[PDB]
From Swiss-Prot, chain B:
The protein's assembly and partners: Component of the mitochondrial small ribosomal subunit (mt-SSU). Mature yeast 74S mitochondrial ribosomes consist of a small (37S) and a large (54S) subunit. The 37S small subunit contains a 15S ribosomal RNA (15S mt-rRNA) and 34 different proteins. The 54S large subunit contains a 21S rRNA (21S mt-rRNA) and 46 different proteins.
Protein's job: Component of the mitochondrial ribosome (mitoribosome), a dedicated translation machinery responsible for the synthesis of mitochondrial genome-encoded proteins, including at least some of the essential transmembrane subunits of the mitochondrial respiratory chain. The mitoribosomes are attached to the mitochondrial inner membrane and translation products are cotranslationally integrated into the membrane.
Species classification: Eukaryota, Fungi, Dikarya, Ascomycota, Saccharomycotina
More info: Present with 259 molecules/cell in log phase SD medium.
Cystine pairings recorded for this chain: C26-C57, C36-C47
Gene designation per UniProt: MRP10
GO terms (BP aspect): mitochondrial translation
Superkingdom field: Eukaryota
Motif Cx9C motif 2 location, chain numbering: 47-57
Naturally occurring in which organism (per UniProt): Saccharomyces cerevisiae (strain ATCC 204508 / S288c)
Record-given protein name: Small ribosomal subunit protein mS37
Cell compartments where the protein resides: Mitochondrion; Mitochondrion matrix
Pfam families: CHCH
Cellular component aspect of the GO annotation: mitochondrial inner membrane; mitochondrial small ribosomal subunit
GO molecular function: structural constituent of ribosome
Motif Cx9C motif 1, residue numbers: 26-36
Swiss-Prot record, chain C:
Record-given protein name: Small ribosomal subunit protein uS2m
Miscellaneous notes: Present with 6890 molecules/cell in log phase SD medium.
Family statement: Belongs to the universal ribosomal protein uS2 family.
Chief localisation class: mitochondrion
Location of the protein in the cell: Mitochondrion
Keywords per UniProt: Mitochondrion, Ribonucleoprotein, Ribosomal protein, Transit peptide
Full-protein interval shown: 128 to 394 of 394
Subunit note: Component of the mitochondrial small ribosomal subunit (mt-SSU). Mature yeast 74S mitochondrial ribosomes consist of a small (37S) and a large (54S) subunit. The 37S small subunit contains a 15S ribosomal RNA (15S mt-rRNA) and 34 different proteins. The 54S large subunit contains a 21S rRNA (21S mt-rRNA) and 46 different proteins.
Any GO molecular function: structural constituent of ribosome
Gene: MRP4
Keyword Cytoplasm applies: no
Protein task: Component of the mitochondrial ribosome (mitoribosome), a dedicated translation machinery responsible for the synthesis of mitochondrial genome-encoded proteins, including at least some of the essential transmembrane subunits of the mitochondrial respiratory chain. The mitoribosomes are attached to the mitochondrial inner membrane and translation products are cotranslationally integrated into the membrane.
One cellular-component annotation, GO: mitochondrion
Gene Ontology BP terms: mitochondrial translation
Curated annotation (Swiss-Prot), chain F:
Organism from which the protein derives: Saccharomyces cerevisiae (strain ATCC 204508 / S288c)
The protein, known as: Small ribosomal subunit protein mS42
InterPro entries recorded: Mn/Fe_SOD_C, Mn/Fe_SOD_N_sf, SOD_C_sf
Further remarks about this protein from its record: Present with 2060 molecules/cell in log phase SD medium.
GO molecular function ontology, one term from the record: structural constituent of ribosome
Gene: RSM26
Biological process according to GO: mitochondrial translation
Annotated family: Belongs to the mitochondrion-specific ribosomal protein mS42 family.
Keywords linked to the UniProt accession: Mitochondrion, Ribonucleoprotein, Ribosomal protein
Subunit structure: Component of the mitochondrial small ribosomal subunit (mt-SSU). Mature yeast 74S mitochondrial ribosomes consist of a small (37S) and a large (54S) subunit. The 37S small subunit contains a 15S ribosomal RNA (15S mt-rRNA) and 34 different proteins. The 54S large subunit contains a 21S rRNA (21S mt-rRNA) and 46 different proteins. mS42 forms a heterodimer with mS43, building a large protuberance adjacent to the mRNA channel exit in the mt-SSU body.
Locations listed in the record: Mitochondrion
Main localization, broad class: mitochondrion
Curated annotation (Swiss-Prot), chain H:
Organism: Saccharomyces cerevisiae (strain ATCC 204508 / S288c) (Baker's yeast)
InterPro entries per UniProt: Rbsml_bS1m-like (IPR016712)
Alphabetical keyword list: Mitochondrion, Phosphoprotein, Ribonucleoprotein, Ribosomal protein
Any one GO biological process: mitochondrial translation
Family label: Belongs to the bacterial ribosomal protein bS1 family.
Summary of the function given for this chain in its UniProt record: Component of the mitochondrial ribosome (mitoribosome), a dedicated translation machinery responsible for the synthesis of mitochondrial genome-encoded proteins, including at least some of the essential transmembrane subunits of the mitochondrial respiratory chain. The mitoribosomes are attached to the mitochondrial inner membrane and translation products are cotranslationally integrated into the membrane. bS1m functionally interacts with the 5'-UTR of mitochondrial mRNAs.
Compartment(s) of residence: Mitochondrion
Protein name: Small ribosomal subunit protein bS1m
Major place of residence: mitochondrion
Outcome, altering P160R: Suppresses defects in the 5'UTLs of COX2 and COX3 mitochondrial mRNAs
Length: 91, 87, 267, 89, 93, 259, 236, 198
């Protein structure tokens, strides 16, 4: 029986390679490991406190554009929608 | 998205490139004594099965134990990786 | 040519020290006359059997890679005159010009070589150790493969007085005569310093300018077409390219060397 | 007549050493197909004929490598020219 | 078996640059322009030196401004400066 | 691209040809068509493939494993075999003296006399000529070639080359007719070969067998069916075996020393 | 750097020394660089037409050279902003070598990704002797590739054997498939036949596929020998 | 013309593609075209790229995305080796239903969707190599990677001892499988079935 961190499990669909079957490969992968992101006025969701609940550090905190990575406009409107939702009773 | 070019630098060496070496293996051994001496008292009736380890850690060398090559890699692959304009 | 040979004997099974000589006879002789690959470039070519200065063509250059330039991101604007356009983020060189530039370049070498010229081909990217050595082999020129000792030309009577100098005649025949201390102790200036990787050998280019010595190089889409007497638009990177261009210059030199060693025969 | 340098490597850093290496390299290319199956001159000894003060450790190691490989050519297939070139060292 | 200051200045460059000795010793005039005494604050004691700009040229159509520097003698730097100038001769239109 | 090699004085062959062997005709359906057809077929297979920069004879050996390349390999060998075939059937008349060569052909060369003597145990080469015909007639069911073959055992033996087998690479000589059921004893050789090669290349080395071929006689339809005929398959072999320019065969045996 | 002077001006420089006395004997090369004077102009010469898409670089649509209200139903009369934004740098700017054939290349390789997987002879051999009759998707020397399909669709759009680019390419697309289909059978025939005619094989595609793979397993097995175990001590 | 020359350039014969050279995403179809080099060029250190490939590379097959880049290097991974997988498909000798081939065997203005075998197959579906295929050995994932193509292992009866025999080295162990068959989902993915002979 064996630990997870040591056994790639490529799905059958893919193309397994001799190297692919190696630990090096496992490490490699790790290293290289959204309707809002799609393009919907994030502000329009000024209420729906459900959608906004997403891009939230789960501590009433929005995220720096290192995680959210949403468009400047999308993220700022998402942030505005969250702030507006705070005003709109729900969330 | 990802993108962060740097400004030219004297050299892109690395500071103390941390290779990683386990903490004085003895330091862990002595620590566990005080991690089983705080409770059970000194030379715990259990620590007998512990001091057995911190013994030779000292003995000949009270301190059982009294690098990296990236700086040249950097020195050689910076005047190439840096996207400086021509000249 | 096999002094250390003991032709097995009579029953002895083919000696595996000479069995190979059978394969050698199986080569130069029978070899593979039945089917012979033709119309195919070989890295072996160029460096040895190169195009005479007049035999060059745009296609020959495009094939040898004397066109692919640096990226459309590292372009010293100083060559909007030698660039032909951008492709796949690479600035393709106007080989039409490269030809004119190579034509002239070759001319200088031949003329120089026809005048006891001291050529010194310089290249430092990896691989040119032979192409260059062989290049000077033909023109009886001189070559440098490693880094260029900064100071070779200007600070000569210090960096290069340990090495000895030979008195050569018009047929390049060592005179086999004594050269006095002071006589052999001076300056042996080159009369045509060819550079093959200008991008990173300026120390030589700048020195030669201040050494009143003509230069001939292989500018790219990055090297500055100005620090050299005869710039030759080309691709500094790949070695097939350089070896093609160097080759053309080399044979241009050889022909002159030939023509020169021929006047001597008239008398 | 013309006064001219003897070695084609003249202008390089350590010209004599480079010239010495070139002959060995030529030999190796010539007899590159010949199948392969100790008392070489010292660094200081090599310097006196080679570069002298301009001789570097890396250059010496390269020279040793060149000689050793040539020597390794199966004694039965070896040439007179190769042995003459190695005689020096 | 083995102006006079100039004789050497030239000989050296003859053996080095290729300029003809005779021209340097008989067809040039080195006339010093600035002969000061700069100095450096080395920790091993304030060290002095002798910067010197000695213009040498053939009063026909060739001038060269050469600088120089020594810590021993001012004239020693002038010799060096004659050198840097005979080395940097340039035709004046 | 590759280039069908020009035949010595093809000038005659164009309308004349090899005395006895063939007038013009023959090579018209072989060297000047068959050879080109597959020479191009290979040149077309070589397109875009390293296998080409090197002479197809080199490729013939190269294309030994990766049987998935056999298509090219079989053709490749045929290309190589044919030229060897033409060389044996090459008139290769001597030049100079202006007057047409008096064909003082050196017959079985001195060395050849002893070579066969040991090869066939104190037997005459001419004796082998028909023995050869016997072997070929009873070692082929369709296409192939005939092949005198010198071995490291200096037994200058003859191999049952078939369709387009590798006269060198023992593992691919194409001798056993897998189509015609073989006696368990040949299977023994097969078993050996399975094992023999199984370990040879096992260290990155296809059996380094210096099984150098010597005399080639195409047994493809073009060889006999083209002109001589059907039952004349053996009869065609007859005239060919009757006379073979030895100059080439003289230089097909590691007889002397060099370097 | 900056257009230097003391590089292409050596003869001028030596001449002076040669006329004065700094030099006594002319540098041999002297004559050569006289016979072949050095190109000194380093002008950023301008461009006027794109070497490829045949486009023109240097024209303005004077309004009169137009009368149909734009699709945006509107007769424009006054010149527009860009239409007055001095575009001189554009002339010097090297134009893009746009080729519709390149799109077809990518299109075919996208539709046939295995063609990309197929080894291609990118190394160009003496491109000079390559006149190729492309009415057939096969040529002596040039191997089979999606590039052939592209150079093929050209006849069908140049000669006009077919109609538009899409239809043209497909006509050859099926032409390619056939050559590939026949090749596939040919490939198997060599073996099958050779397999049934005295042929032994040291290693096959399945063999490299297993040996190299099993080799890799050597490393992984040993590796987990440290990782999994080291954690037991790392946690016990 | 300069362009005409480039329009036929082998460099352009290769299309552009900036797909990552790591592609951690599940892979079914290849991402780039491998560049083959004759051993000759390899010693000459010539690969036809903007910059020469470092001698460190000893392969004759590499994949390139950027002839050259700001970093003054060519972005290439010498691990281009699909040449093996596809060939192994031939080593496996099994055809793909390819839905229904109306008229044209692959049938289909632009055939972007349902491209077809995807150059994984150009042989007549039915042939007699089928003779029960050729039980190609495969590496059981638990699914079994046969010739670089995973095929779900099937058997008359579940053999736990077989899996126990290889223990955790089930993938390390290779078992011959009479491939049932394979198929190319429109996403260019091959799904196949194995025959664990245990």
């Amino acid at each position: 029986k064996i630990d997870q961190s040591l056994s790639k499990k490529l799905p059958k669909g893919t193309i397994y390679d001799p190297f692919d079957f190696s630990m090096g490969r496992i490490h490699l992968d790790r290293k290289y490991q959204d309707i809002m992101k799609s393009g919907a006025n994030p502000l329009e969701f000024y209420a729906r406190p459900r959608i906004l609940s997403r891009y939230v550090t789960s501590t009433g905190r929005i995220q720096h554009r290192d995680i959210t990575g949403l468009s400047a406009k999308n993220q700022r409107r998402l942030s505005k929608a969250i702030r507006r939702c705070q005003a709109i009773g729900l969330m | 998205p990802p993108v962060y070019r740097l400004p030219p630098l004297p050299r892109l060496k690395v500071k103390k490139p941390i290779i990683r070496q386990e903490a004085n293996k003895c330091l862990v051994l002595m620590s566990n004594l005080l991690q089983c001496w705080s409770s059970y008292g000194h030379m715990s009736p259990k620590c007998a099965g512990l001091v057995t380890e911190l013994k030779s850690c000292t003995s000949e060398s009270a301190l059982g134990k009294r690098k990296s090559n990236i700086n040249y890699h950097a020195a050689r692959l910076y005047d190439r990786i840096n996207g400086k304009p021509h000249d | 040519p096999y002094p250390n040979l003991i032709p097995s004997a009579n029953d002895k099974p083919y000696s595996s020290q000479e069995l190979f000589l059978r394969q050698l006879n199986h080569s130069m002789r029978t070899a593979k006359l039945g089917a012979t690959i033709s119309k195919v470039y070989y890295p072996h070519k160029d460096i040895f059997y190169p195009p005479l200065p007049e035999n060059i063509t745009v296609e020959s250059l495009m094939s040898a890679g004397v066109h692919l330039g640096q990226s459309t991101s590292l372009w010293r604007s100083s060559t909007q005159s030698y660039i032909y356009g951008e492709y796949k983020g690479i600035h393709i060189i106007d080989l039409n010009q490269t030809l004119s530039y190579l034509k002239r370049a070759a001319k200088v070498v031949e003329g120089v070589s026809e005048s006891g010229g001291i050529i010194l081909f310089l290249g430092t990217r990896q691989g040119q150790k032979r192409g260059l050595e062989e290049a000077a082999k033909k023109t009886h020129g001189y070559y440098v493969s490693t880094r260029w000792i900064p100071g070779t030309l200007t600070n000569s009577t210090e960096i290069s007085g340990i090495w000895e100098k030979q008195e050569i005649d018009s047929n390049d025949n060592p005179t086999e005569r004594a050269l006095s201390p002071n006589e052999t102790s001076k300056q042996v200036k080159p009369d045509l310093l060819v550079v093959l990787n200008p991008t990173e050998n300026r120390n030589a280019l700048l020195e030669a300018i201040k050494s009143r010595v003509p230069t001939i190089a292989i500018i790219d889409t990055d090297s500055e077409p100005s620090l050299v007497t005869y710039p030759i638009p080309g691709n500094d990177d790949s070695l097939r390219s350089v070896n093609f261009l160097l080759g053309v210059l080399a044979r241009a030199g050889q022909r002159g060397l030939q023509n020169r060693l021929a006047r001597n025969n008239e008398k | 007549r013309r006064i001219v340098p003897k070695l084609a490597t003249f202008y390089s850093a350590n010209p004599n050493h480079e010239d010495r290496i070139n002959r060995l390299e030529r030999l190796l290319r010539k007899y590159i197909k010949l199948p392969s199956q100790a008392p070489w001159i010292s660094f200081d000894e090599y310097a006196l004929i080679g570069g002298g003060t301009k001789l570097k450790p890396t250059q010496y190691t390269q020279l040793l490598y060149m000689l050793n490989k040539l020597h390794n050519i199966d004694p039965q297939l070896t040439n007179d020219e190769i042995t003459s070139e190695l005689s020096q060292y | 078996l083995p102006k006079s200051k100039s004789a050497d200045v030239a000989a050296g460059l003859h053996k080095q640059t290729g300029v003809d000795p005779d021209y340097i010793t008989r067809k040039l005039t080195m006339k010093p322009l600035v002969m000061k005494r700069v100095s450096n604050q080395t920790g091993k004691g304030k060290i002095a030196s002798f910067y010197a700009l000695v213009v040498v040229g053939d009063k026909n159509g060739m001038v060269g401004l050469g600088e120089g520097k020594s810590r021993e003698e001012m004239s020693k730097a002038i010799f060096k400066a004659h050198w840097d100038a005979v080395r940097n001769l340039k035709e004046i239109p | 691209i590759h280039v069908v090699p020009k035949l010595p004085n093809s000038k005659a062959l164009l309308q004349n040809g090899v005395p006895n062997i063939l007038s013009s005709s023959g090579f018209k359906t072989v060297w000047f068509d068959y050879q080109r057809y597959l020479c191009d077929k290979l040149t077309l297979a070589t397109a875009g493939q390293s296998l080409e920069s090197y002479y197809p004879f080199h490729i013939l050996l190269k294309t030994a494993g990766n049987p998935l390349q056999s298509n090219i390999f079989n053709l490749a060998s045929s290309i190589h075999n044919n030229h060897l075939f033409v060389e044996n059937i090459l008139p290769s008349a001597v030049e100079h003296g202006t007057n047409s060569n008096a064909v003082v052909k050196t017959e079985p060369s001195r060395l050849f006399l002893s070579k066969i003597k040991d090869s066939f145990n104190g037997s005459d080469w001419e004796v082998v000529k028909e023995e050869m015909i016997y072997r070929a007639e009873n070692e082929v069911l369709g296409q192939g070639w005939l092949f005198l073959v010198e071995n490291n055992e200096k037994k200058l033996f003859i191999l049952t080359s078939n369709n387009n087998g590798t006269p060198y690479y023992f593992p691919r000589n194409q001798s056993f007719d897998l189509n015609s059921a073989i006696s368990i004893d040949e299977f023994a050789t097969l078993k050996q070969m399975k094992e023999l090669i199984g370990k040879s290349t096992k260290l990155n080395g296809k059996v380094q067998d210096w099984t150098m071929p010597i005399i080639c006689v195409n047994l493809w339809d073009h060889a006999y069916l083209h002109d001589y005929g059907v039952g004349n398959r053996s009869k065609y072999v007859k005239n060919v075996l009757d006379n073979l320019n030895w100059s080439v065969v003289n230089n097909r045996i590691f007889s002397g020393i060099s370097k | 750097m900056k257009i230097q002077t003391n590089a292409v001006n050596v003869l001028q420089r030596t001449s002076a020394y040669l006329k004065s006395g700094l030099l006594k004997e002319t540098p041999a090369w002297y004559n050569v660089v006289a016979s072949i004077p050095p190109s000194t102009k380093f002008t950023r010469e301008p461009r006027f037409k794109n070497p490829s898409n045949g486009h023109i670089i240097g024209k303005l649509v004077d309004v009169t050279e137009q009368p149909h209200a734009n699709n945006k139903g509107l007769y424009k009369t006054r010149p527009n902003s860009s239409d007055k934004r001095v575009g001189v740098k554009r002339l010097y700017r090297p134009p893009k070598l746009t080729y519709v054939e390149d799109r077809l290349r990518s299109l075919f390789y996208k539709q046939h990704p295995w063609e990309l997987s197929r080894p291609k002879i990118l190394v160009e051999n003496e491109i000079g002797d390559e006149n190729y009759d492309w009415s057939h998707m096969l040529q002596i020397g040039r191997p089979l590739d999606g590039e052939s399909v592209i150079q093929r669709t050209m006849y069908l759009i140049k000669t006009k054997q077919y109609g538009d680019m899409v239809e043209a390419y497909d006509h050859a697309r099926y032409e390619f498939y056939a050559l590939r289909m026949q090749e596939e059978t040919e490939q198997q025939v060599a073996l099958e036949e050779a397999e049934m005619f005295g042929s032994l094989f040291g290693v096959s595609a399945i063999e490299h596929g297993i040996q190299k793979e099993q080799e890799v397993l050597d490393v992984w097995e040993k590796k987990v020998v440290e990782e999994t175990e080291l954690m037991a001590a790392r946690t016990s | 013309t300069l362009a005409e020359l480039l329009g036929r350039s082998r460099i352009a014969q290769v299309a552009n593609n900036h797909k990552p050279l790591t592609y951690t995403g599940k892979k079914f179809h290849p991402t780039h075209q491998i560049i083959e080099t004759k051993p000759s060029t390899l010693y000459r250190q010539e690969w036809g790229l903007k910059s020469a490939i470092p001698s460190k590379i000893k392969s004759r097959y590499l994949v390139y995305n950027d002839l050259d880049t700001l970093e003054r290097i060519t972005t290439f991974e010498p691990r281009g080796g699909t040449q093996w997988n596809r060939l192994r498909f031939q080593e496996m000798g099994v055809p793909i239903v390819s839905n229904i081939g109306r008229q044209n065997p692959f049938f289909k203005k632009f055939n972007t969707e349902i491209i077809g075998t995807g150059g994984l197959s150009y042989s007549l579906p039915g042939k007699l190599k089928v003779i029960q295929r050729t039980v190609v050995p495969g590496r059981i994932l638990n699914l079994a990677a046969i010739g670089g193509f995973v095929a779900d292992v099937v058997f008359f009866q579940s053999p736990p001892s077989s899996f126990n025999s290889m223990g955790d080295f089930i993938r390390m162990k290779t078992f011959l499988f009479e491939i049932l068959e394979a198929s190319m989902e429109k996403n260019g993915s091959v799904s196949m079935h194995a025959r664990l002979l245990e």
